Design a protein around this ligand. Structure first.
Ligand code: HEM
Length: 289
């Protein structure tokens, strides 16, 4: 099963920068959302969830087809809350109706990371919408109640190794959990992309507590939280080494996250040899906008 990237007709860097800019300007405008977190984090989560359905064994799922627009996927219980991201992107899609859905969802994540002062994430266009019957079944995204061996095995389906897993998890510096969406009680939340997830893991005094949904999570008296799967990164000695590395080197974490997140957003896509090179979008700030 082969998905070949096909550039939206006649489009180039400039076109996709305009789309980036529209998303970025909306991120700035719509600042109230989720107790002033803004939409950055949920856009990153959306990009991950539309990509994280991928299965390396048969090339099903993945970002290419834009299948999140279909009810089966949109109503996946693992996607609860992501409707807010989709709503946010709707006016952008209406303004730029030529962009494919998988391009838009993935670009929303790139834009979010960058505007939140994260690393540059090179991004390639050419995802093509596919029909409703190509929508992956629910149950391909990970559970949060498990341990390190679960996390490791899970991410092998996505072709991610230990370093890639630990780097990608660092996105949990962004935003929070919501009891109503996932059964986890939200803790202190940020909308700036840093290596703080790793610092929190290593430096806080964590207590295993039960929340009001009767699920266990790790909390600190300072008001942070970790999912079981987050905490697993300091329980497993291989993950722990990488946690420490990223807690001690912001730049390395940025570089590794950029590579892993691009890879995640690109899994399943075949880029023709004469496809454009990846785009690196300027932030609003870099443009003086
Ligand atoms: C074992 C892997 C993972 C698990 C079990 C997991 C689980 C969760 C859960 C339970 C939430 C809370 C949802 C809600 O209540 O609204 C969430 C939020 C979030 N996740 Fe993950 N996640 C994982 C990996 C990732 C990855 C790889 C990324 C992206 C690189 C990511 C990005 C985010 C972001 C940015 C949010 C915050 C959303 C917001 O503030 O609305 N997660 N995750």
């Amino acid at each position: 099963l082969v998905h070949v990237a096909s550039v939206e007709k006649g489009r180039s860097y400039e076109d996709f920068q305009k789309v980036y800019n529209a998303i970025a300007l909306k991120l700035r405008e719509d600042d109230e959302y989720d107790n002033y977190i803004g939409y950055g984090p949920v856009l990153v989560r959306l990009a991950w969830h539309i990509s994280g359905t991928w299965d390396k064994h048969d090339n099903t799922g993945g970002s290419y087809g834009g299948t999140y627009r279909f009810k089966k996927e949109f109503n996946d219980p693992s996607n609860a809350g992501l409707q807010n991201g989709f709503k946010f992107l709707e006016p952008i899609h209406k303004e730029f109706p030529w962009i494919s859905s998988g391009d838009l969802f993935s670009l929303g994540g790139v834009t979010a990371v960058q505007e939140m002062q994260g690393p540059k994430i090179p991004w390639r266009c050419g995802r093509v919408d596919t029909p409703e019957d190509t929508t992956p079944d629910n149950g391909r995204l990970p559970d949060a109640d498990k341990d390190a061996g679960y996390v490791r095995t899970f991410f092998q389906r996505l072709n991610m190794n230990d370093r890639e897993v630990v780097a990608l998890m660092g996105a949990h510096a962004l935003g929070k959990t919501h009891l109503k969406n996932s059964g986890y009680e939200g803790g202190g939340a940020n909308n700036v992309f840093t290596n703080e997830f790793y610092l929190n893991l290593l430096n806080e005094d964590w207590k295993l507590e039960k929340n009001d949904a009767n699920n266990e999570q790790w909390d600190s008296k300072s008001g942070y939280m970790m999912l079981p799967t987050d905490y697993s990164l300091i329980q497993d000695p291989k993950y722990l080494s990488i946690v420490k590395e990223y807690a001690n080197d912001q730049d390395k974490f940025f570089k590794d996250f950029s590579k892993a997140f691009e890879k995640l957003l690109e899994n399943g896509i075949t880029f023709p040899k004469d496809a454009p090179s990846p785009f690196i979008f300027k932030t609003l700030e870099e443009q003086g906008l």
